[PDB]
């Protein structure tokens, strides 16, 4: 029913990290876990298998040597620990239930990177068929994602929220845009909320005509 | 990946397509434990068949599995808009042991031509303010999901500076992409006007904005 994986890494070459699957809604004890990890734009790579009741476990000729899977019973949870970090260890890393893969967690991103994470800098979009369009430009943070709210979330509707560029500075950008009224610019508050997790930094700016 | 898929598959509604599999008499051939999984983008995959030939409940009729000498092959009988995705295979060798496929990208064609729509954004005054500018240029609601962009100082080309997103799928099946242009403010402050140029299907359209 549920397998939920711990939040995003970022992690210097030569360091280690060690993510965790929390299982529920079913008998934890009764299905092994496998860990298969995603390279960005690339294929699906199996890293190996972990018992939750022999005390088994097995690795890809890969990565052994290099990690250790373990389950904690008291908590439901798998862990797995890869060390000797390098950069094309950069990936989204899943948890799988059994020996048919039946069930996914929703993955959990590393990075390795000898570069630290960075917070954006936001500014506004000025608005220049009765509409107009606003928005924020979220310039120049590492790694990914951002989200973007609007009003702290009491407007909705017809906000887009563009997928990110990756510039020649190694860092990302994105646009959030919301069409609104003409009539409304100048009575109406109009305030992007963006948050990123990695640099556990949000930014409120309000976009005016 | 020890497993040889086809780096991309396409047909139309309606019509069947096979992903093949392919591996030697050692795996394939020797061992029956074949998953398939649908990757949707930015999603977990899901498990759509196993054992071969068997559908987890809930998993439409149209998809069904089979294995014939070192090749296992999943089939789309009757392909649907919403079955784009990347498709796996997987295989269980014994010892405790599992290989996936390369992947395979799935393209249903059909949809109607949608030329993109653009809006264009100036520097702010606030980055200005802080020695740089950056000009916005949005594109959204186009199929197909592939543009060109160039821009333009005046009406001459712009050579340095740009960067341009991959399409991506929207919600609404059309595709979205962004492209941003780097200047001084110097720069941007001394020509008449800055043009951002989306070329779709041969048709090229525009914005222009100015200081």
């Known amino acids: 029913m549920q397998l939920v994986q711990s939040g995003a890494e970022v992690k210097k070459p030569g360091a280690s990290v060690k993510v965790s699957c929390k299982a529920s809604?079913?008998?934890?004890?009764?299905?092994?876990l496998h860990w298969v990890r995603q390279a960005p734009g690339q294929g699906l790579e199996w890293m190996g298998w972990?018992?939750?009741?022999?005390?088994?476990?097995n690795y890809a000729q890969k990565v052994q040597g290099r990690v250790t899977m373990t389950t904690d019973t008291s908590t439901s949870t798998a862990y797995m620990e890869l060390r000797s970090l390098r950069s094309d260890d950069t990936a989204i890393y899943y948890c799988?239930?059994?020996?048919?893969?039946?069930?996914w967690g929703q993955g959990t991103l590393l990075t390795v990177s000898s570069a630290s994470t960075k917070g954006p800098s936001v500014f506004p979009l000025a608005p220049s068929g009765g509409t107009a369009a606003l928005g924020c430009l979220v310039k120049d943070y590492f790694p990914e994602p951002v989200t973007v709210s609007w009003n702290s979330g009491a407007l909705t509707s017809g906000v887009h929220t563009f997928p990110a560029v990756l510039q020649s500075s190694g860092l990302y950008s994105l646009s959030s845009v919301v069409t609104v009224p003409s009539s409304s610019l100048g009575t109406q508050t109009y305030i992007c909320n963006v948050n990123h997790k990695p640099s556990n930094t949000k930014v409120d700016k309000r976009v005016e005509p | 990946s020890a497993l040889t898929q086809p780096p991309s598959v396409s047909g139309s509604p309606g019509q069947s397509v096979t992903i093949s599999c392919t591996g030697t008499?050692?795996?394939?051939?020797?061992?029956?434990?074949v998953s398939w999984f649908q990757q949707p983008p930015g999603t977990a995959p899901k498990l759509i068949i196993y054992?071969?030939?068997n559908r987890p409940s809930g998993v439409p009729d149209r998809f069904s599995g089979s294995k014939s000498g070192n090749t296992a092959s999943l089939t789309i009988s009757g392909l649907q808009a919403e079955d784009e995705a990347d498709y796996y295979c997987?295989?269980?060798?014994?010892?405790?042991?599992?290989?996936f496929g390369g992947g395979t990208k799935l393209t249903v064609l059909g949809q109607p031509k949608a030329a993109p729509s653009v809006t264009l954004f100036p520097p702010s005054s606030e980055e200005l303010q802080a020695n740089k500018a950056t000009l916005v240029c949005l594109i959204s609601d186009f199929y197909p999901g592939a543009v060109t962009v160039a821009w333009k100082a005046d009406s001459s080309p712009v050579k340095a500076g740009v960067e341009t997103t991959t399409p991506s799928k929207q919600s609404n099946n059309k595709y979205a992409a962004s492209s941003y242009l780097s200047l001084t403010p110097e720069q941007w402050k001394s020509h008449r006007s800055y043009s951002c140029q989306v070329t779709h299907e041969g048709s090229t359209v525009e914005k222009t904005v100015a200081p």
């Open positions: 799988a239930r059994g020996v048919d893969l039946d069930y």
């Open positions: 809604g079913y008998t934890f004890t009764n299905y092994g």
């Open positions: 972990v018992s939750t009741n022999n005390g088994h476990t």
């Open positions: 008499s050692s795996d394939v051939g020797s061992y029956n434990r």
């Open positions: 054992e071969v030939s």
């Open positions: 997987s295989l269980y060798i014994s010892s405790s042991t599992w290989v």
